[PDB]
């Protein structure tokens, strides 16, 4: 078994998942983002990173994603995988 492919990035989170996952994240965002209602494929995580960046300076989008990849089956290995480098001095444990 090889080593490597550690180059994650907490903006990759969009570019990682397929175009096709991708425009429904760009849906459940459509209302707080207010993307358009017809335009929303137009869009480019590149677009929509930047928007995310300065509306959830928390994390960027990273969490909003995230979520988005936990209700589906084939993207719950990944959110997992993203959580991990979100957090950096653990949660806020209440």
Same mark, same amino acid.
């Given at each position: %078994? #090889? &080593? %490597?492919? &550690?180059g994650i990035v907490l903006l990759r989170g969009l570019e990682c998942i397929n175009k096709?996952?991708? &425009?429904?994240?760009? #849906?459940?965002?459509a209302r707080d983002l207010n993307l358009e209602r017809d335009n929303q494929e137009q869009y480019t995580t590149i677009q929509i990173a930047n928007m995310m960046e300065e509306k959830f300076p928390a994390d960027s989008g990273l969490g909003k994603l995230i979520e988005f990849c936990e209700e589906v089956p084939a993207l719950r290995k990944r959110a997992e995988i993203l959580k991990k480098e979100r957090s950096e001095s653990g949660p806020s444990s209440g």
């Open positions: %078994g #090889s &080593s %490597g492919s &550690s096709h996952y991708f &425009s429904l994240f760009k #849906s459940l965002l």
